[PDB]
Every structure is written in structure tokens, then in C-alpha cells.
Amino acid sequence: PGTVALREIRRYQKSTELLIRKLPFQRLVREIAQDFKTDLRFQSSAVMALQEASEAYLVGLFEDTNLCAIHAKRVTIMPKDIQLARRIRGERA
Amino acid sequence: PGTVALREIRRYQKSTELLIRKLPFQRLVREIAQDFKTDLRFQSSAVMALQEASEAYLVGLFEDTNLCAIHAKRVTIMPKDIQLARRIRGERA
Amino acid sequence: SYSIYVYKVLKQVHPDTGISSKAMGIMNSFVNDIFERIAGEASRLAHYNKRSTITSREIQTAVRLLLPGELAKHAVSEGTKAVTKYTSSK
Amino acid sequence: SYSIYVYKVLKQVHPDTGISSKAMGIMNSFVNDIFERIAGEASRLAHYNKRSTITSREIQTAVRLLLPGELAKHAVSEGTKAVTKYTSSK
Amino acid sequence: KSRSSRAGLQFPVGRVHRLLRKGNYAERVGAGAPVYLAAVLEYLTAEILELAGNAARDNKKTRIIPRHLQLAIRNDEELNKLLGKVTIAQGGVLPNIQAVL
Amino acid sequence: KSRSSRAGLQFPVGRVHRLLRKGNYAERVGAGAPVYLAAVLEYLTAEILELAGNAARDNKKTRIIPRHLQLAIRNDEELNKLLGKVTIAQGGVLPNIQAVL
Amino acid sequence: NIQGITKPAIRRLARRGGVKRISGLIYEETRGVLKVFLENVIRDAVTYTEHAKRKTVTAMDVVYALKRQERTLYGFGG
Amino acid sequence: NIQGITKPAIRRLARRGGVKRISGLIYEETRGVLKVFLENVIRDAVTYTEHAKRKTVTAMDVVYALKRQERTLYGFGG
Numbered sequence: 001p002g003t004v005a006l007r008e009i010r011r012y013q014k015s016t017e018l019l020i021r022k023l024p025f026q027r028l029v030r031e032i033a034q035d036f037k038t039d040l041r042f043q044s045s046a047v048m049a050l051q052e053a054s055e056a057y058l059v060g061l062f063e064d065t066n067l068c069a070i071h072a073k074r075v076t077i078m079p080k081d082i083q084l085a086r087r088i089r090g091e092r093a
Numbered sequence: 094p095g096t097v098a099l100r101e102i103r104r105y106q107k108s109t110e111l112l113i114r115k116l117p118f119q120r121l122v123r124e125i126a127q128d129f130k131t132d133l134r135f136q137s138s139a140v141m142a143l144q145e146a147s148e149a150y151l152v153g154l155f156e157d158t159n160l161c162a163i164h165a166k167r168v169t170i171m172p173k174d175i176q177l178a179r180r181i182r183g184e185r186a
Numbered sequence: 187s188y189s190i191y192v193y194k195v196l197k198q199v200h201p202d203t204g205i206s207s208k209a210m211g212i213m214n215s216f217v218n219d220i221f222e223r224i225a226g227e228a229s230r231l232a233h234y235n236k237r238s239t240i241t242s243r244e245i246q247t248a249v250r251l252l253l254p255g256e257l258a259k260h261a262v263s264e265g266t267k268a269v270t271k272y273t274s275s276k
Numbered sequence: 277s278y279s280i281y282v283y284k285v286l287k288q289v290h291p292d293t294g295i296s297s298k299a300m301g302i303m304n305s306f307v308n309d310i311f312e313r314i315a316g317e318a319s320r321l322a323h324y325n326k327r328s329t330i331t332s333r334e335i336q337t338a339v340r341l342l343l344p345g346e347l348a349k350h351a352v353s354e355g356t357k358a359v360t361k362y363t364s365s366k
Numbered sequence: 367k368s369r370s371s372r373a374g375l376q377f378p379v380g381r382v383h384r385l386l387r388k389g390n391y392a393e394r395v396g397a398g399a400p401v402y403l404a405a406v407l408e409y410l411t412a413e414i415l416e417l418a419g420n421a422a423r424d425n426k427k428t429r430i431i432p433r434h435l436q437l438a439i440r441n442d443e444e445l446n447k448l449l450g451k452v453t454i455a456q457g458g459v460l461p462n463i464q465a466v467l
Numbered sequence: 468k469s470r471s472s473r474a475g476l477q478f479p480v481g482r483v484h485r486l487l488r489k490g491n492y493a494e495r496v497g498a499g500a501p502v503y504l505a506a507v508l509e510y511l512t513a514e515i516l517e518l519a520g521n522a523a524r525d526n527k528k529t530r531i532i533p534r535h536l537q538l539a540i541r542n543d544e545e546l547n548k549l550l551g552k553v554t555i556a557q558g559g560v561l562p563n564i565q566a567v568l
Numbered sequence: 569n570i571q572g573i574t575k576p577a578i579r580r581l582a583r584r585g586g587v588k589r590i591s592g593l594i595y596e597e598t599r600g601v602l603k604v605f606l607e608n609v610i611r612d613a614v615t616y617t618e619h620a621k622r623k624t625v626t627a628m629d630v631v632y633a634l635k636r637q638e639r640t641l642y643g644f645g646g
Numbered sequence: 647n648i649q650g651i652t653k654p655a656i657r658r659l660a661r662r663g664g665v666k667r668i669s670g671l672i673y674e675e676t677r678g679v680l681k682v683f684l685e686n687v688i689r690d691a692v693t694y695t696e697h698a699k700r701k702t703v704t705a706m707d708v709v710y711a712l713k714r715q716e717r718t719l720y721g722f723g724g
Contacts, residue, residue, distance in 0.1 A: 002666070005661075005666045005667065006463065006467065006666065008657075008658075008661045009463055009661050009662075009664055009665075009666065010461075010463075011661075012658050012661040012662045013458075013459060013461045013462070013463075013661070013662055013664065014458075014461060015458060015662065016432070016433050016456050016457070016458035017456075019655050019658040019659050019662070020651060020652075020655045020659075021650075021652070021655070023650075024650030024651060024652075025650075025651075027647055027650060028647055028648055028650060028651070028681075028684065029684065029688065031647045032681075032684055032685055032688050033688055033692060033703070036688065036689055036692045036693075037692050037695075037696065039701055040692060040695070040701065040702075040703060041701060041702045041703070042702070042703045043702060043703070043704055043705060045705040045722060046691075046703050046704055046705040046707065046708050048705070048722075049455075049705045049708040049709065049712075049719060049721075049722045050684065050687065050688070050691075050708050052453065052455045052456070052719065052721070053453060053687070053708070053712055053717060053719050054680060054683060054684060055659060056453040056719075057683055057717070058659050058663075058676070058679075058680065059459055059659055059660075059662045059663040060663075061663070061679065062659060062660050062662070062663025062664070062665050063459075063663045063664055064180075064181050065663070065665070065672075066464065066663060066664055066665050067177060067180060067181065067464070068161075068164060068177070068181075069665075070464060070466055071161060071164055071165060071173075071177050072164060072165045072166075073165075074667075075466075075467065075666050075667045076666075076667035076668065076669050077660070077665050077667070077668055077669060077672055078669045078671065078672065079669070079671050079672055079675040080164075082672060082675055082676070082679065084160060084161070084164050085181055086679070087157075087160060088157050088160065088161075088178055088181040088182060089181060089182075090551070090552075092548070093678075093682050095588070098583075098588045098589065099564065099568065099588065101579075101580075101583045102564055102583050102584075102586055102587075102588065103562075103564075104583075105580050105583040105584045106559075106560060106562045106563070106564075106583070106584055106586065107559075107562060108559060108584065109533070109534050109557050109558070109559035110557075112577050112580040112581050112584070113573060113574075113577045113581075114572075114574070114577070116572075117572030117573060117574075118572075118573075120569055120572060121569055121570055121572060121573070121603075121606065122606065122610065124569045125603075125606055125607055125610050126610055126614060126625070129610065129611055129614045129615075130614050130617075130618065132623055133614060133617070133623065133624075133625060134623060134624045134625070135624070135625045136624060136625070136626055136627060138627040138644060139613075139625050139626055139627040139629065139630050141627070141644075142556075142627045142630040142631065142634075142641060142643075142644045143606065143609065143610070143613075143630050145554065145556045145557070145641065145643070146554060146609070146630070146634055146639060146641050147602060147605060147606060148581060149554040149641075150605055150639070151581050151585075151598070151601075151602065152560055152581055152582075152584045152585040153585075154585070154601065155581060155582050155584070155585025155586070155587050156560075156585045156586055158585070158587070158594075159565065159585060159586055159587050160565070162587075163565060163567055167589075168567075168568065168588050168589045169588075169589035169590065169591050170582070170587050170589070170590055170591060170594055171591045171593065171594065172591070172593050172594055172597040175594060175597055175598070175601065179601070183450070183451075185447070186600075186604050187724070188377075188411075191376050191377050191378065191408070191411075192411055192415070194376045195376050195377075195408060195411050195412050195415060196415050196419070196430075198376070198412070199412050199415055199416045199419060200415070200416070200419035200422075202428070203419045203422055203423065203428055203429070203430060204428055204429040204430065205415075205429060205430040206429050206430065206431045206432070208431065208432055208455070208456060208721065209418075209429075209430050209431050209432050209434070209435060211455070211720070211721045211722070211723075212432055212435050212454055212455065212457075212720040212721045213411065213415070213435070214723070214724055215719070215720035215721055215722070215723065215724045216410075216411070216414070216449070216720060217407055217411060217724070218723075218724025219452070219718060219720070219724060220406075220407065220410060220448075221382070221385065221403070221407060222724075224403060224406065225385075225386060225389060225391050225403070226391070228391065228399075228403075229391040229392060229491065230632075231616075231619060232392060233490065233491065234616070234619075234620075234628075234632065235619060235620050238392070238393035238394060238491075239392055239393060239394045239395065239396055240386065240391060240392035240394075240395045240396065240399050241396045241398070241399060242396060242398035242399050242401070242402040243619075244399070245399055245402040245403050245406070246402065247615060247618075247619050249406055250615055251612055251615055251636060252448075253448060254444040254445075254447045254448055255444060256444065257413075257444045257445070257448065260409060261406045261409050261410065264405050264406060264408075264409040265402040265403075265405040265406050265409075266402075267405075268373045268374065268375060268401055268402065268404070268405035269373070269398040269401050269402045269405070271372070271373055271374050272369065272372050272373035272379075272398065272401045273397075273398065275372045275373070275374075276372075277646070278478075278512075281477050281478050281479065281509070281512075282512055282516070284477045285477050285478075285509060285512050285513050285516060286516050286520070286531075288477070288513070289513050289516055289517045289520060290516070290517070290520035290523075292529070293520045293523055293524065293529055293530070293531060294529055294530040294531065295516075295530060295531040296530050296531065296532045296533070298532065298533055298556070298557060298643065299519075299530075299531050299532050299533050299535070299536060301556070301642070301643045301644070301645075302533055302536050302555055302556065302558075302642040302643045303512065303516070303536070304645070304646055305641070305642035305643055305644070305645065305646045306511075306512070306515070306550070306642060307508055307512060307646070308645075308646025309553070309640060309642070309646060310507075310508065310511060310549075311483070311486065311504070311508060312646075314504060314507065315486075315487060315490060315492050315504070316492070318492065318500075318504075319390065319492040319493060320710075321694075321697060322493060323389065323390065324694070324697075324698075324706075324710065325697060325698050328390075328493070328494035328495060329493055329494060329495045329496065329497055330487065330492060330493035330495075330496045330497065330500050331497045331499070331500060332497060332499035332500050332502070332503040333697075334500070335500055335503040335504050335507070336503065337693060337696075337697050339507055340693055341690055341693055341714060342549075343549060344545040344546075344548045344549055345545060346545065347514075347545045347546070347549065350510060351507045351510050351511065354506050354507060354509075354510040355503040355504075355506040355507050355510075356503075357506075358474045358475065358476060358502055358503065358505070358506035359474070359499040359502050359503045359506070361473070361474055361475050362470065362473050362474035362480075362499065362502045363498075363499065365473045365474070365475075366473075390491060390492065390493060390494055391491065392491060393491055432721070451716060451717060451718055452718045452719075452720060453717060453718065453719045453720065454720050454721070455719060455720055455721030455722065456721070457720075458662075459662055459663075462664060463664055464664060467664075467666050533643070552638060552639060552640055553640045553641075553642060554639060554640065554641045554642065555642050555643070556641060556642055556643030556644065557643070558642075559584075560584055560585075563586060564586055565586060568586075568588050
């Protein structure tokens with residue numbers, strides 16, 4: 001329902017904390033690093049830097065996605081919005 | 094009508110020539126340069142470089158605009174598309 | 187790295203408002219960043235004009251190029267004011 | 277500026293296909309561009325690792341960083357092949 | 367006497383001078399170069415530090431935390447361009463809800 | 468004997484060597500540096516020049532004009548990334564109409 | 569003066585962009601962007617000129633201006 | 647393993663983005679992008695590490711990696 005949604009926007013927009021649990025993220029980084037070089041170790045701050053940048057990247061993406069969703073007539077964001085945003089952003093997989 | 098439109102797309106997509114009349118463009122450049130420095134003169138190639146870059150910029154913009162127009166349900170491109178594109182492109186006036 | 191100075195500048199602007207270590211981290215990133223940016227363009231300007239030395243005249247043009255509208259005008263003023271004092275203030 | 281070489285390379289690849297002056301202009305822009313790009317990163321890599329000299333080891337890492345996926349692998353091979361010939365081919 | 371004081375500055379003219387040559391930016395950097403650059407650095411520092419300090423007060427605090435730098439940078443239209451593609455660690459995002467909601 | 472021939476290359480090793488030091492990139496550039504860089508430059512040149520030459524034939528011509536470089540660069544997925552934010556003067560655009568039309 | 573740009577020309581530019589239908593308003597809207605794009609580029613372009621003490625803006629100036637804009641242009645040097 | 651990222655977390659991330667309603671599909675879609683983003687960044691990050699002969703990826707490596715990505719990050723040095 002609309003009221004809780006906005007209430008959540010308001011609260012999480014006022015927030016400054018990392019929204020993903022530290023551990024799961026760290027694992028994702030290790031489980032990725034292993035491809036490029038098997039004997040790799042990341043300092044905790046280096047991992048931290050990645051999360052700060054990762055979540056920053058994502059909300060920024062979300063904002064743009066939101067603008068696309070609204071561009072039609074919707075309030076609900078679909079994959080096609082993330083894609084249209086990333087497209088115009090020049091991003092690629 | 095659809096048939097002529099596509100026929101025009103096909104022809105102008107195959108084309109490589111500058112689509113704006115040289116003269117009007119050159120005037121626009123002079124009539125702008127005058128602000129920054131009154132005693133300014135542009136070589137013809139420098140002007141040419143500006144047009145190559147200007148029209149390039151514009152079709153590129155148009156492509157993106159087109160993707161926005163289509164994003165709703167439309168085929169006709171409106172200002173709100175150019176704006177949504179420029180927004181996600183990070184551009185500003 | 188700049189913490190000394192940025193703190194010194196802080197008291198000069200808000201002589202009662204402190205700054206966190208983490209926020210100081212950011213300030214340091216900012217200082218190094220725009221330094222890197224300005225010196226990069228300055229260096230670029232010098233090669234273009236086939237000059238082997240980076241004059242203050244390059245720092246200025248670099249500043250005009252990288253900084254926004256009116257934010258650039260002050261930076262030039264401040265720099266000229268500063269450079270001139272130093273040169274005369276032998 | 278590179279027209280000599282790019283033409284020399286052209287005949288080597290298509291010994292019957294010519295190239296326009298305007299197209300040659302582009303090729304020259306390309307050569308200078310990626311040169312500027314690669315040397316820029318190479319230089320960046322050297323300062324980071326507090327080295328006063330740009331080794332071929334920097335050109336390589338720079339190449340890995342700037343060039344796409346598999347397009348980078350060849351460039352490294354070609355460069356190593358080339359460097360090694362020159363070094364041994366005294 | 368100090369080059370930083372001769373120029374009436376806080377930022378280290380000397381340090382900036384070292385960085386300019388070490389950096390391998392130039393062949394030889396002039397005398398006024400670091401003093402001009404040091405000057406601009408100090409200026410911008412004061413600028414964002416000012417707006418930041420304001421936002422710190424406006425909430426309720428005395429210590430400036432990243433959020434303030436963020437809120438500060440994003441709210442000044444001119445500073446927002448300069449640090450457009452910059453991410454302030456723990457800066458968070460500027461409160462904003464698209465009207466249509 | 469020539470440094471370009473010793474390295475089995477077309478691109479001017481010497482020239483590249485001059486540019487590396489003049490450029491004020493480094494303090495001192497090594498011996499293999501220009502030979503490696505010259506090598507990569509020649510490679511990429513050959514690559515795009517090849518694909519370009521193909522497109523020239525595919526149409527009907529013998530001379531490679533910008534359109535070919537363009538069509539060439541844009542069609543190779545890998546080359547398209549490298550020269551992503553590059554504008555080929557008189558290159559035109561890659562023929563393409565969004566399906567939905 | 570920007571009115572010298574033309575409906576045709578913009579339609580062609582749109583066509584090359586793969587645009588089928590064009591609302592009558594985008595012609596003036598496009599003039600808006602083309603002007604802003606040129607101002608930004610010419611501003612930095614003359615700043616480069618005002619640096620070598622040259623009253624004439626060379627094509628290499630427009631190039632550096634464009635590179636600063638994040639828009640590399642091939643065909644006028646390097 | 648990326649499944650360790652969570653619906654909540656992504657919803658929060660979306661909330662901070664000013665998103666009101668979230669289709670159930672964007673959770674997996676977002677995981678797609680987050681992974682690609684991290685791969686690209688960590689790849690260049692370890693390339694910088696493999697350069698100083700350090701087996702440990704320092705925070706300055708992630709910074710240079712990000713600057714190469716066009717994403718400057720403040721707070722971990724400079």
C-alpha cells in the first residue's frame with residue numbers, strides 16, 4: 001500500500017548505512033576474485049570500498065530506472081526499465 | 094504515412110553527408126563565438142569539425158530519444174523523450 | 187595528508203564546528219582529486235602549446251576549463267590574489 | 277603523420293585495397309588516440325607504484341586495462357613477441 | 367619565511383610544488399604554479415567546508431559528518447557539477463520523491 | 468640496423484620512443500616500452516584496417532572510405548567498446564531500425 | 569539565428585536516428601539542445617584558443633574542446 | 647552465492663532510490679547487474695594488484711579500478 005512505501009522511501013532516503021549484510025557481500029567478492037586470481041585476499045577496507053561503491057551505483061541506477069517506469073504510466077519498476085536506463089547510460093554486460 | 098517514413102530512415106541511414114546547410118550553421122557558430130570573444134575567427138575546418146560533432150551528437154541523441162518514445166507505447170517522439178534521455182545521459186543545460 | 191590544513195581552513199570558516207575522521211577522509215579525497223584534475227589539464231595545455239614548463243597561466247586556464255561557471259571566477263581571483271601577494275611579498 | 281605506416285600495414289593486409297585521404301585522417305586520429313590512452317595509463321601505473329620509469333611491463337598492464345577482452349590478449353602477445361625479437365635481435 | 371605565509375595561504379605551497387614535479391606532469395614547473403594551485407585548493411576546500419558546516423548546524427550537530435558534505439555538495443548546483451561523478455562514502459542520497467508519487 | 472626492423476614491425480619504434488619521453492609521461496622510459504607500444508599500435512591498426520577493407524569489398528569498392536571504418540568498427544562488438552565514445556567523421560551511422568516499427 | 573537550422577534537416581537527423589514519427593514540438597526543443605551543445609563546446613574551444621594567443625580557433629581547438637566534453641572526434645588530427 | 651544479496655536489501659536500495667512499487671522480477675535482474683558491476687571492477691582491481699606484485703588487493707586498488715570505470719570514490723585515500 002502506498003502509505004508504507006513512501007514511509008520506507010522517507011526513512012531509507014534519510015539513512016546513510018549500508019543496506020546489504022556485510023558477510024554475504026564479502027563472500028560474493030571472494031567468490032568472484034577467485035576467477036581472476038586464485039591466491040587473492042582483499043583487505044577489509046578494500047571490500048568496504050567496493051560495497052560503498054556498489055550500493056551507491058545501485059541506488060543511482062534505481063533512480064534512473066524509476067524515471068523510466070514513470071515515463072510510461074507506472075509506479076512499479078520492471079526489468080525493461082533497468083534495461084532502458086542501462087542502455088541510455090551506455091552500460092553493457 | 095508509415096511507408097515513406099521508413100523509406101526515409103533507410104535512405105538517411107545509408108547516407109554519410111551532413112544534413113544541415115553549411116552556411117546557416119557557420120552563422121550560428123559565429124553568432125555564438127561573439128559572446129566569449131568579439132575578435133574571433135574560426136577556420137573552415139574548425140567549423141566543419143563542429144558540425145561533424147554536432148550532427149553526430151544529435152542522431153545519437155535521437156536514437157536514445159526514440160528508445161524512450163517506444164518505451165511507452167509510441168512511435169512519435171516528444172520533448173519529454175529528449176528530456177528523459179538527456180536526464181539519464183547526465184546532460185544539463 | 188591534508189587534515190592539518192583542511193582543519194585549519196575549517197576553524198577559519200566555522201570556528202566552532204568540528205569534523206569527523208571519516209568526513210576528513212572524504213575531504214582528503216576531494217583535495218587530491220581536483221589537484222589531479224587541475225594538474226592533468228594544466229599538463230595537457232602545456233604539451234599542446236609545446237611548452238616544457240607548467241606556468242601559473244596554465245593552472246588558471248585549467249581552472250577555467252574544469253570548474254563551473256562562477257565557481258571558477260572566484261578560484262581565478264583567489265589564485266591571482268594569492269600568486270601576486272607571493273611574488274611581490276618577496 | 278602515420279600515413280606511411282598505416283599504408284604499409286594496409287598493403288600487408290589487403291594488397292589491393294586503397295584508402296582515402298579522409299579515411300587516412302581517421303586512421304591517424306585512431307593511432308594518436310589509443311597511443312595517448314595507453315601511455316596515459318602506463319604513466320598512471322608507474323606513479324602508483326612509485327617507479328620513475330615506464331617499463332614495457334607498464335605498457336602491457338595498461339593494454340590489459342584499456343583494451344577489450346580478447347582484443348587485449350592478442351595485443352599482449354604481439355607486444356611480447358615484438359619486444360622479445362628486438363631484445364634478442366641485438 | 368614560509369611560502370604558504372608569503373602567499374597568505376593555509377594549504378602547503380611547498381607540498382603542492384613537490385607534487386607538481388614528482389607527478390611528472392611537467393618538465394619544469396614555474397614558481398607561481400604551486401602557489402596558484404594551492405590557492406584554488408584552499409578556496410574550494412573552504413567553499414564546500416562552509417556549506418557542509420551549515421548543514422551540520424541545520425540538523426542539530428557540531429561535528430561535520432559525510433552526510434553533511436553530501437547534502438552540501440548536492441544542494442549547491444555549481445558544486446554538484448564539479449563532483450558529479452563522485453561518490454561520497456557514507457554520504458547517502460539527497461532526500462527526494464518524484465512528485466507523481 | 469633499424470629498431471623497427473629489429474622488432475619486425477612497420478610502425479616507427481623510434482618515433483614512439485620520442486613521443487613517450489617528450490610527452491612528459493615518464494621520468495625515463497625503458498628500451499622495450501616503445502617497441503611494445505609500437506607493436507600494439509600496429510596490431511590494432513591492422514585489425515580495424517582488415518575489417519574495414521572487408522566492408523569496402525562487400526559494398527563494391529577498392530578504396531576504403533570512412534563509412535567502411537565506421538561500419539567496421541561498429542560491427543565488431545569488441546572494437547565497438549574501445550571506440551565507444553569516438554565519432555568517425557563522415558562515418559555515418561550503422562543501418563538499423565527498431566523492430567517495433 | 570538558430571532558426572536557420574531546418575525542419576527538414578532536423579527530420580533527416582531524426583531519420584538517421586531511426587525516428588519514424590516526429591511531434592511538431594521537437595523541432596524547437598532540438599534547437600535548444602543543439603545551441604547548448606555548441607555553446608559548451610565553443611566556450612572551451614575558444615578558451616584553448618585564448619591560451620596560445622591565437623585569434624583564430626583552429627580545428628585542433630574544437631578537438632580538445634570535444635575531448636574535454638567526453639566526445640573524441642577522428643578526422644581532424646589527433 | 648549472489649543469492650546472499652536479499653529481497654529486503656534490494657527493496658531498501660530501491661527505496662533509497664525513490665522507488666515505490668517493485669515488480670518481483672527486478673530482484674533477480676538487479677543481482678545480474680550487481681554481479682557484472684563487481685566483476686568489471688574487481689577484474690581491473692586485481693590487475694592493479696598483480697602489478698605491484700601484491701597478493702592482497704588494497705583499498706587503493708579498488709579506487710583506481712573505480713576511477714577507470716568513471717566512478718570516483720571519496721573516503722579511502724586519493
